[PDB]
Amino acid sequence: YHGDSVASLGTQPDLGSALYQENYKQMKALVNQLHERVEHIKLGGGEKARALHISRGKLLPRERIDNLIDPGSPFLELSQFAGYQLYDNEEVPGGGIITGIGRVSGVECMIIANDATVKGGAYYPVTVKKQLRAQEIAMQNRLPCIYLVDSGGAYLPRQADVFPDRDHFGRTFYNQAIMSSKNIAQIAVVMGSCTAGGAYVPAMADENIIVRKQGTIFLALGGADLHCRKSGVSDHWALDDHHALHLTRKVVRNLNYQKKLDVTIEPSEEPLFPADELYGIVGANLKRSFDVREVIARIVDGSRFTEFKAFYGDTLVTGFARIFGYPVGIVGNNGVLFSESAKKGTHFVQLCCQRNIPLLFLQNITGFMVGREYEAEGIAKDGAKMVAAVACAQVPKITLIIGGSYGAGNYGMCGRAYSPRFLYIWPNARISVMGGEQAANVLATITKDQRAREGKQFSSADEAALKEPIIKKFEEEGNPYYSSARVWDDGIIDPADTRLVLGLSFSAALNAPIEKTDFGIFRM
Amino acid sequence: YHGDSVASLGTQPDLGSALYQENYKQMKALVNQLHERVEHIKLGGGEKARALHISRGKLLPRERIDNLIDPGSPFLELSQFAGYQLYDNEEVPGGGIITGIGRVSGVECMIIANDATVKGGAYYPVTVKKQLRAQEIAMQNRLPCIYLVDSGGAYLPRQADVFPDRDHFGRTFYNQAIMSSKNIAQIAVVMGSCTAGGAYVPAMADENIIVRKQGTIFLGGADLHCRKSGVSDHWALDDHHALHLTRKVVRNLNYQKKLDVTIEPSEEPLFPADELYGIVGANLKRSFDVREVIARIVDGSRFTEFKAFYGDTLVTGFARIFGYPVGIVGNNGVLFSESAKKGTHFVQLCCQRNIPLLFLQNITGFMVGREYEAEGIAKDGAKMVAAVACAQVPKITLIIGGSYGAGNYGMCGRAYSPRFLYIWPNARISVMGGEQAANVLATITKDQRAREGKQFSSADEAALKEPIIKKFEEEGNPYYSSARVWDDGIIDPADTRLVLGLSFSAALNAPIEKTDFGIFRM
Amino acid sequence: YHGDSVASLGTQPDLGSALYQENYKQMKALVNQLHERVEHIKLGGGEKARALHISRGKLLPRERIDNLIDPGSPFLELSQFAGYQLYDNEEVPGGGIITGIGRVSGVECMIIANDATVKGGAYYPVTVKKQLRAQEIAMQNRLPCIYLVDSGGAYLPRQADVFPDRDHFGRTFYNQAIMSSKNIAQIAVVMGSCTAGGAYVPAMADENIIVRKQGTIFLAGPPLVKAATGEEVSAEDLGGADLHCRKSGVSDHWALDDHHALHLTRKVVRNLNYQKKLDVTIEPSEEPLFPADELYGIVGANLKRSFDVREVIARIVDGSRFTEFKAFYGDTLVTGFARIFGYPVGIVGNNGVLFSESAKKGTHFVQLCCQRNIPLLFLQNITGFMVGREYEAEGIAKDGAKMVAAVACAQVPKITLIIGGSYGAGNYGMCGRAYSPRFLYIWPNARISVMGGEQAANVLATITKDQRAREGKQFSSADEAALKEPIIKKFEEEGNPYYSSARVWDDGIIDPADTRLVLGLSFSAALNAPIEKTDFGIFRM
Numbered sequence A: 001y002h003g004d005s006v007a008s009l010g011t012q013p014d015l016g017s018a019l020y021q022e023n024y025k026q027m028k029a030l031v032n033q034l035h036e037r038v039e040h041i042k043l044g045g046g047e048k049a050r051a052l053h054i055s056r057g058k059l060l061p062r063e064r065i066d067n068l069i070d071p072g073s074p075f076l077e078l079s080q081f082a083g084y085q086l087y088d089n090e091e092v093p094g095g096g097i098i099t100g101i102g103r104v105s106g107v108e109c110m111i112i113a114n115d116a117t118v119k120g121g122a123y124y125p126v127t128v129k130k131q132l133r134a135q136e137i138a139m140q141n142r143l144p145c146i147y148l149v150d151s152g153g154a155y156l157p158r159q160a161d162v163f164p165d166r167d168h169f170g171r172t173f174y175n176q177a178i179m180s181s182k183n184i185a186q187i188a189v190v191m192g193s194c195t196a197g198g199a200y201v202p203a204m205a206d207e208n209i210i211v212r213k214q215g216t217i218f219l220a221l222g223g224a225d226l227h228c229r230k231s232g233v234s235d236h237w238a239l240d241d242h243h244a245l246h247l248t249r250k251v252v253r254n255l256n257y258q259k260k261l262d263v264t265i266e267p268s269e270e271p272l273f274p275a276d277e278l279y280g281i282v283g284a285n286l287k288r289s290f291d292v293r294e295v296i297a298r299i300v301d302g303s304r305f306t307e308f309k310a311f312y313g314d315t316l317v318t319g320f321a322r323i324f325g326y327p328v329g330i331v332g333n334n335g336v337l338f339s340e341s342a343k344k345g346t347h348f349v350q351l352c353c354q355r356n357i358p359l360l361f362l363q364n365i366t367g368f369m370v371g372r373e374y375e376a377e378g379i380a381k382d383g384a385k386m387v388a389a390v391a392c393a394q395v396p397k398i399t400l401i402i403g404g405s406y407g408a409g410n411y412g413m414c415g416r417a418y419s420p421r422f423l424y425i426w427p428n429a430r431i432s433v434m435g436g437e438q439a440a441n442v443l444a445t446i447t448k449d450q451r452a453r454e455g456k457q458f459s460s461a462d463e464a465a466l467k468e469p470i471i472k473k474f475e476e477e478g479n480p481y482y483s484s485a486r487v488w489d490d491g492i493i494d495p496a497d498t499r500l501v502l503g504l505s506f507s508a509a510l511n512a513p514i515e516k517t518d519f520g521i522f523r524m
Numbered sequence B: 001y002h003g004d005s006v007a008s009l010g011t012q013p014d015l016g017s018a019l020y021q022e023n024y025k026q027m028k029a030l031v032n033q034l035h036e037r038v039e040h041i042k043l044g045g046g047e048k049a050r051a052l053h054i055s056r057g058k059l060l061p062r063e064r065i066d067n068l069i070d071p072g073s074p075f076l077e078l079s080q081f082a083g084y085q086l087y088d089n090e091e092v093p094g095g096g097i098i099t100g101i102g103r104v105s106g107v108e109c110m111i112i113a114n115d116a117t118v119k120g121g122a123y124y125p126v127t128v129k130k131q132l133r134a135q136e137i138a139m140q141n142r143l144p145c146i147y148l149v150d151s152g153g154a155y156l157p158r159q160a161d162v163f164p165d166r167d168h169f170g171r172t173f174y175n176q177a178i179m180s181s182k183n184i185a186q187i188a189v190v191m192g193s194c195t196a197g198g199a200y201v202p203a204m205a206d207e208n209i210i211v212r213k214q215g216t217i218f219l220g221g222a223d224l225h226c227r228k229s230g231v232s233d234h235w236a237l238d239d240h241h242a243l244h245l246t247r248k249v250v251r252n253l254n255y256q257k258k259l260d261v262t263i264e265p266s267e268e269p270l271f272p273a274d275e276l277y278g279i280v281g282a283n284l285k286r287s288f289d290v291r292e293v294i295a296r297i298v299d300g301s302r303f304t305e306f307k308a309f310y311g312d313t314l315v316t317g318f319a320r321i322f323g324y325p326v327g328i329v330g331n332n333g334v335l336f337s338e339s340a341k342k343g344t345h346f347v348q349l350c351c352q353r354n355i356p357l358l359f360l361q362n363i364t365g366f367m368v369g370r371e372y373e374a375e376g377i378a379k380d381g382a383k384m385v386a387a388v389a390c391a392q393v394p395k396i397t398l399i400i401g402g403s404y405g406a407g408n409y410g411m412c413g414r415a416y417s418p419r420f421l422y423i424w425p426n427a428r429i430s431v432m433g434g435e436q437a438a439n440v441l442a443t444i445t446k447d448q449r450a451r452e453g454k455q456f457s458s459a460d461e462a463a464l465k466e467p468i469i470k471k472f473e474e475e476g477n478p479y480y481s482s483a484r485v486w487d488d489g490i491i492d493p494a495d496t497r498l499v500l501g502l503s504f505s506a507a508l509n510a511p512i513e514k515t516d517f518g519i520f521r522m
Numbered sequence C: 001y002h003g004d005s006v007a008s009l010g011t012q013p014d015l016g017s018a019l020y021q022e023n024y025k026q027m028k029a030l031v032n033q034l035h036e037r038v039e040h041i042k043l044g045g046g047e048k049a050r051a052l053h054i055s056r057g058k059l060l061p062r063e064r065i066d067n068l069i070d071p072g073s074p075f076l077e078l079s080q081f082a083g084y085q086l087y088d089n090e091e092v093p094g095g096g097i098i099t100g101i102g103r104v105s106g107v108e109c110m111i112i113a114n115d116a117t118v119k120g121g122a123y124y125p126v127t128v129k130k131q132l133r134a135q136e137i138a139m140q141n142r143l144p145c146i147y148l149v150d151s152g153g154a155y156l157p158r159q160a161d162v163f164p165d166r167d168h169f170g171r172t173f174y175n176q177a178i179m180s181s182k183n184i185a186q187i188a189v190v191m192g193s194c195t196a197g198g199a200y201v202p203a204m205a206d207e208n209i210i211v212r213k214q215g216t217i218f219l220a221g222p223p224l225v226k227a228a229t230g231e232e233v234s235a236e237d238l239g240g241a242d243l244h245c246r247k248s249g250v251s252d253h254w255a256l257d258d259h260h261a262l263h264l265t266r267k268v269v270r271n272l273n274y275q276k277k278l279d280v281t282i283e284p285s286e287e288p289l290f291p292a293d294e295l296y297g298i299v300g301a302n303l304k305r306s307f308d309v310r311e312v313i314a315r316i317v318d319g320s321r322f323t324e325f326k327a328f329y330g331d332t333l334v335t336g337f338a339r340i341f342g343y344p345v346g347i348v349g350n351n352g353v354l355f356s357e358s359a360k361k362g363t364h365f366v367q368l369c370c371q372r373n374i375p376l377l378f379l380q381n382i383t384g385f386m387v388g389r390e391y392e393a394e395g396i397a398k399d400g401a402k403m404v405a406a407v408a409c410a411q412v413p414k415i416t417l418i419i420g421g422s423y424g425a426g427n428y429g430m431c432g433r434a435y436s437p438r439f440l441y442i443w444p445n446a447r448i449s450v451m452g453g454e455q456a457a458n459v460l461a462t463i464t465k466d467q468r469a470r471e472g473k474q475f476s477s478a479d480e481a482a483l484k485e486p487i488i489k490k491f492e493e494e495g496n497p498y499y500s501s502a503r504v505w506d507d508g509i510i511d512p513a514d515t516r517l518v519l520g521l522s523f524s525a526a527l528n529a530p531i532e533k534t535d536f537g538i539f540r541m
Ligand SMILES: CC(C)=CC(=O)SCCNC(=O)CCNC(=O)[C@H](O)C(C)(C)COP(=O)(O)OP(=O)(O)OC[C@@H]1O[C@H](n2cnc3c(N)ncnc32)[C@@H](O)[C@@H]1OP(=O)(O)O
Pocket: A119, A120, A121, A122, A123, A151, A152, A153, A154, A155, A156, A157, A169, A193, A194, A195, A196, A197, A198, B405, B406, B431, B440, B444, B448
């Protein structure tokens, strides 16, 4: 009997309240800023570079992606802000590469396309990191990889940050070989002149498509006709960009792959409240606190939520819901973490792992302005319990940072270091080891005590002098754009699109089967 | 019948030749420089810090490691040069942490000890990278991990490089939890005051040992944690008692090492190792036969070459080190299609027979050949790159000379996850040689300017070349690569045999899995 | 480096103290009583029955077992006191059957022999339970089973307690078939006339050995055949060694007499092609540093007094070496690592009332032992509630369960020894009989029940008084006293170790001086089977 009636979460906010108006105004300003910056990034490398690229008879990378994917299918771009102000004087729109997940011939695939307009397609360190992240996502979710290779190889300056280390350029070929060995299809489309680094990519790909004249593969001489007829590196011969994309679609169709789901499914229903109210509900000030249940009610199917252990450790919210017919276990933050909250989270994570249910984390860690210590030693014994449970979980984990994320709370709530399938942040998020004010006080006290043992007086004025720069540095570093410029936290997302982004991410992540979970020693 | 006689590799070098004398002099100078720098690094954080540390009654980290391991057992320290001149004005001897592999109660274990004298044990980014590398080594080789925790947490400045990212501090706890779940024992000895980051380490460890007064886990103390909070698992009076308890705990692990590969009696090489100084020298332009190096590091100087006359620029064959079968793949010149194919065949054979692989890299500069139709090499170089990546046997890479371009990837570079990687003091690593890079930059700028209609000055090409050559030389230095956690540590060539034996003995703990290969272009 | 020195547990007790003398006297009296009762049980069914059995040319069952096993090898008999005063007027020495573990041709095997002198080998309910327990032990430890079949079938009276139910006689054949399917060898030696129930045993066995004249296998005896169909036939003609060997083909070997049958059984066991391999590491065995007989004085016979379990541990472990785990947290529970005869073991003992900290510490230790694949040994001495009426036991419930689950889900070999009281949920927590330990033993001074007699008496009086008060019936103060005296007596009689041993619970009683030897034999037997991985349920936390 699936007809039983069930109470629904969420409540209607007070639109007339001044707090709602102010929060809505701040969030709208942030979202407009994000949209305009994304537009400028989408503009590309530059006018002259784009003109030359079009004159050569090639298609712009975004046009290539648009023609490659199925008509009208949504595209989930990743890390649009990579390289945003990362380097002092060089502009690298989008990191020089484009990555995302789209549907090709009815199959979800990961697409990696080089933007030839940005430094002739040379690989900056951020470009390598972005490509490695995309490859890791594809390997974890068992998604076929499609490469639109048009690059000039590694950026000769800054070679030390791109060539030598483990997570440097060679890891690309390593991942390609491993994923090929694991039956994850690799398809390389040589849409332009490659280089020594670029040349290896088509060689390791299972199937190659090279354009007649623009495509040129040389290890350091290289052409479509030569590679197709004598060297044999090329697998398909394409007249131009459109023909290459058509051939790629055909090749993807001939993959003989069928997606099968392990989790149960139910008909999808929209949430009972508009998503745009999240602007007023959340606002842009981290000092104020908002109930995460509103956010949950505005992003779940039918606003139906089954809370688990509601009255025990109420600072943490856990329960079961469904997004687009997908069961999910939601773990959100409603305040400071305590021992009871950690135990409740561990219990919920164990339940979800046992039942093979995907997990969703909503992080809003709180500053220590309210509580200086609160005998945090008790928290250590139990915080670890969660950190381990989260790490050992094998179900798909998606983390969304809707507010502050500081200290060990970031690790506890499935931080970037614990390998979530996807990680997103809202435009108002802040991430750092601790808040700037708290950090400033710690540095002043340590220096004063050490100086006192040394016998050097520590000036009271000096403590104030140290505090002002530290607060500014922490604010600049914690910015969402600072974190997105580095490949951490994938990309920033408009709160109004949270439901769609989560649905797409879970649909992509459900491709891989769910394995059994093995836990370590649970310190009692 | 194992009595059959077999020819032995190697030949006696000409000591009287001036080239041998010059090479020996250069290598001796390099080794002396390395030894003195290692001594200074071993000195520690500083005199005042060491005096304060001894005052508080604690033991110095090297003394802790010496007392922990079995008496007289060798210790294989890793990445001794981490943080060497990495930061502009701050000195971080050894990266602030000590990692290595030693035998505790007859069991090989990975030991990670914080040096409290360096910035009070605060974690620099290089410290986090070094600890992560040690944890990865232990996980790959299934070695128990022992932590001598004495740290002040993450360095508050430079927090962005230590806290947030995947390979940042949280990966430590992630690896700890995973290795605990995989039955790899975790033991934490709280030998001093920890912090927020330090506190989590003992919590996630299977067994904890905390000193009575120096140990403080946060408010936090040995008595409190042992009696009321229950975080501590053992109570130790002082450092010596804690080390004794750690030895007992390791003894109670119920673990027995079993080998899959066959073993034979060990025999010493037929030639002295110190002749490698004269044979190799310090000049990368000159070429030396890798067969000499092989003959001076294998048991009895016995080598069975495979495909000797096909692709002679690459040397492959079978030998034994300390009774351990090994497949040696060395460089004798520029890589060609035949060399790539031969290497792929040998790697397939070794993977099929479950034999550990050893790579000796000496990639050559392009001064001799500008292009040589390198397009042919691309089709076949990738076949070797894949074969190397897909291999599941233990792989150890040693860089005895230059390592440039895709040759680094082909010969099991750092990006392809070898179990261990070492470099000799005369090695050079970079994307390409400085001279070659200088020419490429000048040509690209001139051609782009010509299309633009801007004349590119001939003097400008010379102006660009001199700085590029200097930058490439400084970046390629072995100490530059060792300061970053790449290439573990530098090793004296005279100790290559011992280092390889220890590394293979450690790596043989884990069982050898089956190898699955991907699509092959051929 | 295994040469490192290690502190040793245990201390020298004060022999001159009067408490030691009194405890020693009480324990010596108990042990002497146990020894004399065991001697009387070993005497057998009776003089006339033994005389008839010998006159028929057969060997007594104990002689059969002695000749079967390897010369000089120790024999670990199980449940010697089964059926001791179980039935009102019928005496069933040893339950009518003999079970134990011994070495045959260098292989540890489980031996089940029927005592024909007791009721002509008829199966009492206790006999069926004992045989089922032996079969379960053999299946768990993967030990070959040897049956010396000489029985008259199910006891016709009391048939309802032997035939119908799941744990009744048919479970014997079920276990035989399952163990045969799992490559655990089954060998049946028909040493005497069987019956309908007895006949099926040789049929299901992989190999049969039947004596020439004494052995007779008939699916229905002559009297049974006459009752069922009115047919007259001699016992030998209906079922005999020659007939079964030559025409019916049920018999696999033909034996002239008992000695020949035992020799053939030894040969058959030799041709099993089995080699024992150990998974756990081994070390040279060393004797404990203190005499075992001091346990008499240390423990005594009074459960009210408390003794340190560390003494018992120090007197039964190799070299008296013990590595305590979490010594100062939850000190009422003792946990640590030691070695018995070179075998690693995790010891979990009781030193007082169980608390939340003790339960958490036990759960942690059990998880560690399961992860490292180390056998577990439980020493139970649960305490009465005279000291603490409630102590907010609600806190204990939240954490006691965690231990109960951890213990249940463990897959390592578990051996439980009850050295004192075992009451309430503490019995379940410390690997009670319901949680399937490989072996369970009790000392002669142990007491087991749901709660102590005094505590139970108070509970019954209060419940009746409150219910009567709501009813409006006055509950007499004298009535409360009247209810208390019988309850205390019933609890004392039921809790007796002999009461529990008469039923097949707790296997057998063991002299404390032989605890080390018994544990060594039990662990050596249990190490035959490989150690599987352990999967845990939800750890409520
Ligand atoms: C993997 C391993 C193991 C090793 C290797 O991979 S070693 C790879 C060596 N690379 C090459 O061998 C490619 C050399 N390029 C060329 O042959 C072409 O240039 C193309 C193919 C790039 C097409 O580009 P193009 O020629 O059509 O146009 P262009 O405007 O000239 O393109 C931008 C201009 O390139 C300059 N530029 C700066 N850095 C680089 C760089 N690293 N690579 C290429 N170009 C770069 C840029 O600064 C200037 O513009 P700017 O900055 O002055 O405005």
